[PDB]
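Sample 1 of the test manifest.
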Amino acid sequence: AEVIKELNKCREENSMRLDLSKRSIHILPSSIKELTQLTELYLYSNKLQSLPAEVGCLVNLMTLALSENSLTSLPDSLDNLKKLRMLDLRHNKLREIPSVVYRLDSLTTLYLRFNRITTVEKDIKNLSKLSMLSIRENKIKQLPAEIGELCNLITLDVAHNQLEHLPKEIGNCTQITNLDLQHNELLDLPDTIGNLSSLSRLGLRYNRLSAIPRSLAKCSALEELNLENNNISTLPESLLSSLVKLNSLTLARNCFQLYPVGGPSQFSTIYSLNMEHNRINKIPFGIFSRAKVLSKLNMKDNQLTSLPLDFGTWTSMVELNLATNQLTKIPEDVSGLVSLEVLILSNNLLKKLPHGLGNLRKLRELDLEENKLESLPNEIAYLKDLQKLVLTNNQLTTLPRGIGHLTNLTHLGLGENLLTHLPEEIGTLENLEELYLNDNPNLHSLPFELALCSKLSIMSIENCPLSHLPPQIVAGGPSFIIQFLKMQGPYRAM
Ligand SMILES: [Mg+2]
């Protein structure tokens, strides 16, 4: 109806771009054959199950945009579009690459993401002008050796498929800079992967890799190496020191029991190292002695029972996550870690903290949730940069009076402890915003000085008896308690 007039409009305008997207089109009219001047046809977001043979009359088409339709194929007449440069077939119902697509040898850009494709035929070698090929989110089990004739490829995306291997002939696609293989079933990578010398983005997470080829050392433009969720427990001893632009290394969710063995400069370039969810039973002595730029270490969910003798020499570390290990002590040498801003120690077996904690002048966040802490050291008072202090689920009965010296503290989590009272010095926490006191069964009062925390907007007190406060006030909840402390206490300003 309106597409009749829009096709008609295009005819009289002689416009070389036709946009029929988002028009609920089920059947494309035959008359589209008349608009032979078109170089761009936009049919995306429609209801098309098929393109008519008349589309092959649009022999000047350079762009055919068909995403978000219900196509199963394309007309054999598309053969006649000898100038077609980009075909966009995302989000359709293709069970295979349409036969005609294998003859569109002028194509440089082919988008096939989100279909039902299982096989790439050997005839893929005909599309040797392709620089962008995306077949992400399909059902592909293997690629043909003839992928190696796509020598102009820059981006090859086959993420979210069923690949178990990659043909060694991928090593002939020497222009590739972005190769995404994540979320496949990959058991290995070919030793020829090193032939991809301009490789700068390699997607490998969520596969079944048990090793990395040593030839990957040749891909020295790589700026990230994310091996998350595989089956890796070692690395080629030469690999990391060859990746001289490597910024970040993720070994999370693998089966490392020991740090990978590497050169002296194995960690000399990365800023971030993520080894969370492995089986690592110790951190080697000296492992960060040449890691001047490494500032984030994540060791969460491993098997650590202690820390190396030179722990206190990690002077560049800024964020350290040792959550979900089996640490029983933090050594006094933690005083060495003068750059630390974030220290996460939740879910260990700590009973006390070293006095040396007080040397962490830049510490902003300290998370001690789910330990066995029985006290805090007085030297906590010197953490003047501390903003967030999480002590949830410990065995604390009192806090040091010096807790009130934490000028910058905004978040204080004391839920699930054994507290009998809060110090009056809580009132000098001028910046306190969130105070969690829930599930302290022996906490029977709150100090009037709590009224002095003018920025206090959240406090939890569920399952505290608070029997030294009036029953109806306690039943009113945090809002009523704070108002009561202000009105009955001695601190009203006027
Ligand atoms: Mg899958």
